[PDB]
Amino acid sequence: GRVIRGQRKGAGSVFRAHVKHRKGAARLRAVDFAERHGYIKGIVKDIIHDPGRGAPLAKVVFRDPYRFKKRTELFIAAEGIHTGQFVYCGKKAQLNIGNVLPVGTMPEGTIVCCLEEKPGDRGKLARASGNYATVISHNPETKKTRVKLPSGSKKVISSANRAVVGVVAGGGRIDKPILKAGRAYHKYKAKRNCWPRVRGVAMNPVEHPFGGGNHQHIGKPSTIRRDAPAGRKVGLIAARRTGR
Amino acid sequence: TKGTSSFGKRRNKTHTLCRRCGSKAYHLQKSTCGKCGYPAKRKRKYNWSAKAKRRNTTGTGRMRHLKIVYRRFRHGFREGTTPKPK
RNA sequence: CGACUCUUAGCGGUGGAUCACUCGGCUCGUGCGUCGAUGAAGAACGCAGCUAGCUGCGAGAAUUAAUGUGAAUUGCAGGACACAUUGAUCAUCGACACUUCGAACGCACUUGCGGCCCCGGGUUCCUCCCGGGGCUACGCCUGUCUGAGCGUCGCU
RNA sequence: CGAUCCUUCUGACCUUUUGGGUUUUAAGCAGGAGGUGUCAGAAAAGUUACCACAGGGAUAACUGGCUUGUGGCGGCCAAGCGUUCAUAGCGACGUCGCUUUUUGAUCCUUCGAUGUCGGCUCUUCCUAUCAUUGUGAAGCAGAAUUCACCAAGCGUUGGAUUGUUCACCCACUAAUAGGGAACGUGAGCUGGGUUUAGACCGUCGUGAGACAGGUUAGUUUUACCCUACUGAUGAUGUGUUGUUGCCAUGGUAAUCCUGCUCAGUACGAGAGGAACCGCAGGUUCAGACAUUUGGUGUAUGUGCUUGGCUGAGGAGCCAAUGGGG
RNA sequence: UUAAUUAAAACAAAGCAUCGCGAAGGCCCGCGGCGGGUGUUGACGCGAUGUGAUUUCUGCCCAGUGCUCUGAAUGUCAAAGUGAAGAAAUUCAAUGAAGCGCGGGUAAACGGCGGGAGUAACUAUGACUCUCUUAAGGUAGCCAAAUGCCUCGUCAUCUAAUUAGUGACGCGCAUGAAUGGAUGAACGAGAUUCCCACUGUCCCUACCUACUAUCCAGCGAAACCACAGCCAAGGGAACGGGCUUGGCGGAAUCAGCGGGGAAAGAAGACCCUGUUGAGCUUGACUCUAGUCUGGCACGGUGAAGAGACAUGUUUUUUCACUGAC
RNA sequence: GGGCAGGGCGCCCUGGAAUGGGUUCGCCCCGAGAGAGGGGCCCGUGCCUUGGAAAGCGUCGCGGUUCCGGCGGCGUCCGGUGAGCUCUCGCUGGCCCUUGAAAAUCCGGGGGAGAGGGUGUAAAUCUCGCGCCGGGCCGUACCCAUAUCCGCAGCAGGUCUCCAAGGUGAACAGCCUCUGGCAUGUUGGAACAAUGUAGGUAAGGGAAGUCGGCAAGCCGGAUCCGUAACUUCGGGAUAAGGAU
RNA sequence: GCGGGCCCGGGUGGAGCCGCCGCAGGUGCAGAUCUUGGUGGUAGUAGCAAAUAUUCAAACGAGAACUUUGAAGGCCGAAGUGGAGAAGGGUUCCAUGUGAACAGCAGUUGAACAUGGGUCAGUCGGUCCUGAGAGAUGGGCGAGCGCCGUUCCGAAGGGACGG
RNA sequence: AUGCCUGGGCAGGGCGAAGCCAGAGGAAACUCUGGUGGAGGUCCGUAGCGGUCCUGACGUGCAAAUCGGUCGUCCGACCUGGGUAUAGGGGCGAAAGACUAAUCGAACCAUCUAGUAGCUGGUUCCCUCCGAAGUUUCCCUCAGGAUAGCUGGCGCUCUCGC
RNA sequence: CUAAGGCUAAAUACCGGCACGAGACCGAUAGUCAACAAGUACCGUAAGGGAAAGUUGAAAAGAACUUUGAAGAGAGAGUUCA
RNA sequence: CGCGACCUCAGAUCAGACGUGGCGACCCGCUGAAUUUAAGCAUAUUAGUCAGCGGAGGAGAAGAAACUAACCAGGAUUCCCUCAGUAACGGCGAGUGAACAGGGAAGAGCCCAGCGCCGAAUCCCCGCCCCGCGGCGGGGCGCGGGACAUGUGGCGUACGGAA
Ligand SMILES: [Mg+2]
Ligand SMILES: [Mg+2]
Ligand SMILES: [Mg+2]
Ligand SMILES: [Mg+2]
Ligand SMILES: [Mg+2]
Ligand SMILES: [Mg+2]
Ligand SMILES: [Mg+2]
Ligand SMILES: [Mg+2]
Ligand SMILES: [Mg+2]
Ligand SMILES: [Mg+2]
Ligand SMILES: [Mg+2]
Ligand SMILES: [Mg+2]
Ligand SMILES: [Mg+2]
Ligand SMILES: [Mg+2]
Ligand SMILES: [Mg+2]
Ligand SMILES: [Mg+2]
Ligand SMILES: [Mg+2]
Ligand SMILES: [Mg+2]
Ligand SMILES: [Mg+2]
Ligand SMILES: [Mg+2]
Ligand SMILES: [Mg+2]
Ligand SMILES: [Mg+2]
Ligand SMILES: [Mg+2]
Ligand SMILES: [Mg+2]
Ligand SMILES: [Mg+2]
Ligand SMILES: [Mg+2]
Ligand SMILES: [Mg+2]
Ligand SMILES: [Mg+2]
Ligand SMILES: [Mg+2]
Ligand SMILES: [Mg+2]
Ligand SMILES: [Mg+2]
Ligand SMILES: [Mg+2]
Ligand SMILES: [Mg+2]
Ligand SMILES: [Mg+2]
Ligand SMILES: [Mg+2]
Ligand SMILES: [Mg+2]
Ligand SMILES: [Mg+2]
Ligand SMILES: [Mg+2]
Ligand SMILES: [Mg+2]
Ligand SMILES: [Mg+2]
Ligand SMILES: [Mg+2]
Ligand SMILES: [Mg+2]
Ligand SMILES: [Mg+2]
Ligand SMILES: [Mg+2]
Ligand SMILES: [Mg+2]
Ligand SMILES: [Mg+2]
Ligand SMILES: [Mg+2]
Ligand SMILES: [Mg+2]
Ligand SMILES: [Mg+2]
Ligand SMILES: [Mg+2]
Ligand SMILES: [Mg+2]
Ligand SMILES: [Mg+2]
Ligand SMILES: [Mg+2]
Ligand SMILES: [Mg+2]
Ligand SMILES: [Zn+2]
């Protein structure tokens, strides 16, 4: 009768993200007249490490062409981006690494990162540590562009939405083994309270459907329908196939 | 360990004196009384504890203003008059 | 006959049963049937010559004024009063007064920080500073003033 | 072979269908059916070793009670085994008994609780006698062997394995006989195994879970009361005290073995091979005692030593008895 | 890691392998909202599981229960809509979504992976052969294991002696491959066997020290209490301190002691009953949040086309617009 | 406050180096300017000086029956050392699939919107040196733990910190001592019976006891030798075993 | 008087009480591990045994093993039985006096009791700032007390210089 | 119990990973020797944290879980103060049904509530008279009821040693 | 009858509040928890829980004074009908 | 390119008022169970009850038929007796369960919108004068303001009304 683990994550207050020392949301620059028609140049100041995120971030300072002030954005640093480098963004921006421009302008076969799912959402796709999206084809009619996500799926997006040329810096983290429970603890201490995971078969049958029994076994098929109530949808959710 | 040893570390208090009811029931962290509900405009009371209602009711306190109202009604709520001078 | 132990009786101990008392309860019935932003209920803190509690009172703090009555209050002193005098105490109570929280009302609850006017100390309005006095919450109705609209129109 | 309620069918020129009239529908009246097999008729799957409550000795798991099927033990007849010969020693086919040291049947006492299996320690009792004392019998020549009688006085051991009762082996021995005492003995001990809660394996079940199937870790409380017992003051009488004694009554205790001589004798074809009286001693048990040997040792007795402390020498102290002869 | 009986082989752990999700999304919270957590997030991420370092390997089976895929070639299929006859209430008919049926995939999903005979010039075993069967009939490995009833299996070693330990065999009641098999250095207050040294665990006990216990001055409770307290036998509610017959009995006490008082504690924790409950499970009976699907309203504008009825109506299929959202 | 030692500089000027050089415990640096010279800046809690010897302390002697916070002579000195302990400052590195707070508040800089008096004066002084006035309200005792807190109590339990001498010794280990603290932990006296609780010692045997080496005992520090099977090559390892 | 009980005598007591005919009831105790209060045996018994330790003389005092002073012997042995704080306590701090009650013996002693006294800030902290978080307005929900949310469906700054 | 914010703390030794220096061998690849270095979810071990064994002491105790010896760990998945968040069919849980104020296989407080019990226990003065049954039938009935039977009380209708 | 608009006293109820009256009621373990400094003391972090406790005497006339003891305590004396 | 009316919408320490909370025995509007009974239990019963929320007064609510009846008719609402443990509801089981008429207590009726007729004939606020002003009213004087034609007031409402 007890509420199982996984349901208690929805309420929060113990599974909330650890955002105390995070440097800020890594959002792409907002669309304006310069971005839409020409291009605007910014200067890379420093590359910062964001806790809980493998990919490093880069602070780029622009100048607002409406008021006398210096705007600062926190982009996701691509491979090869160094401090004291001019980075351009706009329709007329050239095809260089760390240079955000609309996908319609970029030719086919281009590798991009921080791709916008919708025009103006300031970057949503292929931005984790080293992932990248590849543009496949352009459709001048209806203003559509096909992109291949790192998951292997192909999605059709508008040609207006922008993306950053190159791959996300910091790739290859998963190659190094953790080798210790302590390193996993330190890794997950900066993200959430989710690392120590207890198997359902090791629990009592009051707090998990897989618990109980004189032998540590499941006793029921692990596959479960997607239309299953909370507290029962555990194991392999809507598994088309299960084995190796 | 759960008994005598555990009673040793009762060092910090959770309730303080409420300024509306006067009882030591004001919760510090929640900023709520639970005896009268001071942050709430209405006083806290329930019908499942009649003895609690009897402990703090109209007749318990000073009745500094109501006792005068009783006699003023008993004579007729007269105002702005004086008895006949000698 | 000894000491201890057992029963009964007289007296003396522990204990407060019984009886008689009762300014207290329970039940029924009659009349009236009244709170508060002019600040309710409740809470806190203080007030007596000697005053802890109860009760009463609110910096005018064991009570002020007025009315009625008429020689006390009292545990002790002190005494005011001439009790042939509005005159001690009492009761009534219509005048006045009524600290801090609390619907609680400048902002929060630490008794901490402020703003708008007037007066005094300092000045000779000179702003600092000090003290005192009056304001500064939310919602809402009528009306006044100042406003906005590529809302609907009229003149130029 | 089947009540109420409900449904369905059949019957009347049947009643109502509500202010009245007509027509559908519906509700009634009477007779059949649809069914309750727990059959005088609820609509109904498990587990709990995480468990709870009210009770029950009306009811189980101990002991104790009746019985003795079964277990154990003992007789009666005598077909036969025994070289001949039923009864030296056995004894079929039949039959008569005893014991509750085995498992069984019963539920009589105990469920407002009588602490269980073993092992250790200790006392006493029984004989259905293993050995020792005294004897009867042989298919007893000696030795040895078994059968039987009076007989429980005194003995019935040390270990490997297993929690074990039981069981088997090694060694010694005269013998390593069998049992009871709430299946003696947990305010006597232990907790190894049963038998709570945590876990592992195998089987079973969809599952939670189950297993006289295995494995592992798992708190053993209280006596100062009465009696009993062990000791210690005492008590009624003897006029009071002291000395020396008697005795009724209770308890009781000693036990077994080896070597020499007999004697390589009796006996015996031989192989082998005794016994009595004597001598020297040993095992177990009981009562004492420290001359000797050993142990203890804080006479804190006397040296020797580590660290520190009284300035040092000397003399000492502290280090829960500093340590060591 | 179970505070207060279980520190462990249990949990966790890096490694390994699957499942879902490209955002009006996956998982989840919330009675409620243009609500909220993951998310200051974007597949090298988040969420859900299984196994559990390194090495090696990961056998066969989709019959069953799950999960998943598409599919007007479709049996069943509610509401709403359409037609029918009737005076109407109506009933009938056609149409007809999801889901169940029907067809594939998936076991590092839950899981499972047999039996009977004949047969090699001594016996034995058995290569090999035949038949019946399921969805395959246990493959590589391993074992009398923490897993084997028989069992203290058989042989060797370890001992004088071993139900213990180890090493081999497989006949495996009932081993077995991510419900992971085998192996494995270091490590472990984890479970066992043997050996060296060591020692009072023992043969077999003794002595010494400190604090109690002892006595005294002072101070001083609690548990418990039908009445009380010497035995044998009898009968009795089948084990008496009281009853009967006998043995007998003598004030008041002190220090021990644990045989008895079926001693004290807790209205037995075991078992059974109750038309008494609770935690948990599901193929038990009734339901329910959530979730999938269909209809009605918010729900408009334009352009083309077809079926059906009929000789204008509905169904409407597709495309385009935004002003609702 | 002023001055000066002493540290640090990823600050500057001359100059251009292989025969490579400088340099640390380690590192590290150099034609993107190393060694060698000359400067500059920061911290200076250290030394001298005003404060400040007047005061404080150790001594020796007095005034005053008493009260009396007094009066006076002297001294408060010279040096060296240390992987020594603690605090602090400063360089240099190593680790992160861990990257290790916000705000109040203060300051510097880029610009010149504007001001000033006009030839002795003014506007300005992120005020240079002095001089004047004010700083409101609340807490301040004591315990802070084998007796002032929580456990029913003066309960062997629990409860967050700072200061940290000598000897021995690797050591903040154990033992003794100094400054400081106390009376032995809700009582004392007299004996030393049995059972106990806590320490030990035991001839010969050495686990024969027990379910089981339970408990106890054996070894133990340092120096010099030596150290096997196995192994993931890292370990095992203080293996084991010897001498001082 | 079979009995339930009752009538007299004596003592204590000091203010109300009873018989008969009827009426009415919160009307009769030995038990309920009954409720409340009190009192026994146990019993002058268990016990006043965790952390090495006390002795001598004097003073006050009716009274001294426990108070004070001096001497001796000890322990805590700078992670102390030392010196100061935080939370908590709330007068327990200081002086004087009493020994009724408490400090499980005693006490001339005390944290007991009774009288008084004592806490002095621009510089030490609260006060200021924000952190994790909490929580109004606008907005939405809710039958409703209210709830959701902290920038989200806001005409959100009442401030300032120069004229 | 867990997450977050802000602070504090953790003697003395052993083993000896990278990196670096010097010497020797080589034709090179490079390899040996001696040093420096101080890495490790490293080891012995104190403080701290925890609690294996003696199944020791105690077990109407110092204590409603403490004490002695012996123990595991002791630079990291470490220990700890204060602030803050999660509230009862809920929380939290390196998972023991563990913890959630001495209570946890569903906390505490008040009310519904004097909940129900076919089940235990108790149920208060005297005398007189009469005086039983554990049996039939039915019941989800077997520790219980209804129904017949057994019992008491109140009468009535009559007969008569009239 | 004329809904989807509205007003209206009386006969009715009153375990709270103000002020009175009464009883076949209880008489300090009873009657309200509370006859008295009772929602008080006290307990728990809190929601909350929650007591025990009346009587000299008509009048204090409440025992002057002597004596032992440090005192608590006694022996005399005195008051009162006691 | 600005001004002037209107409609919608803001700011006020603008002038004058109003609501907030408490008690809650009785009352009104919501929400709303389980113990329990059925000898089990799920519909039922407990029960529109307790618990929870909101809102007043001295009473509250209700109230003058879109009624009852089917008679030779009655005639607002509220309460008492009876109807009546009845009609009816209900595993038609346990159980639940009104209304009409009749006799009484009391008794009281009315007002708008619309329809239409009257020169908005109507109402609120500010100034002055007179009266009384301690439950701030009446009259008069103000080319003083505002509301109102997106409709105030007079006549008039089902029993008919207006001329
Ligand atoms: Mg488990
Ligand atoms: Mg479940
Ligand atoms: Mg289990
Ligand atoms: Mg029986
Ligand atoms: Mg037999
Ligand atoms: Mg012979
Ligand atoms: Mg026995
Ligand atoms: Mg016994
Ligand atoms: Mg025992
Ligand atoms: Mg065991
Ligand atoms: Mg178990
Ligand atoms: Mg299975
Ligand atoms: Mg010497
Ligand atoms: Mg435990
Ligand atoms: Mg343990
Ligand atoms: Mg799996
Ligand atoms: Mg399948
Ligand atoms: Mg052995
Ligand atoms: Mg198998
Ligand atoms: Mg398996
Ligand atoms: Mg008896
Ligand atoms: Mg006994
Ligand atoms: Mg019972
Ligand atoms: Mg039954
Ligand atoms: Mg149930
Ligand atoms: Mg240089
Ligand atoms: Mg202080
Ligand atoms: Mg003490
Ligand atoms: Mg001692
Ligand atoms: Mg002492
Ligand atoms: Mg020995
Ligand atoms: Mg040992
Ligand atoms: Mg080894
Ligand atoms: Mg004694
Ligand atoms: Mg010591
Ligand atoms: Mg101290
Ligand atoms: Mg003091
Ligand atoms: Mg005392
Ligand atoms: Mg023990
Ligand atoms: Mg004891
Ligand atoms: Mg379990
Ligand atoms: Mg009752
Ligand atoms: Mg029954
Ligand atoms: Mg009779
Ligand atoms: Mg009779
Ligand atoms: Mg009372
Ligand atoms: Mg029922
Ligand atoms: Mg019942
Ligand atoms: Mg029931
Ligand atoms: Mg109902
Ligand atoms: Mg009305
Ligand atoms: Mg009527
Ligand atoms: Mg009737
Ligand atoms: Mg009109
Ligand atoms: Zn309050």
From Swiss-Prot, chain B:
GO CC term (a single one): cytosolic large ribosomal subunit
Cellular compartments annotated: Cytoplasm
GO biological process: positive regulation of signal transduction by p53 class mediator; translation
Pfam families: Ribosomal_L37e
PROSITE patterns: RIBOSOMAL_L37E
Residues annotated with N6-acetyllysine modification: 9
A GO term for molecular function: ubiquitin ligase inhibitor activity
InterPro entries for this protein: Ribosomal_eL37, Ribosomal_eL37/eL43, Ribosomal_eL37_CS, Ribosomal_zn-bd
Family label: Belongs to the eukaryotic ribosomal protein eL37 family.
Protein name: Large ribosomal subunit protein eL37
Name of the coding gene: RPL37
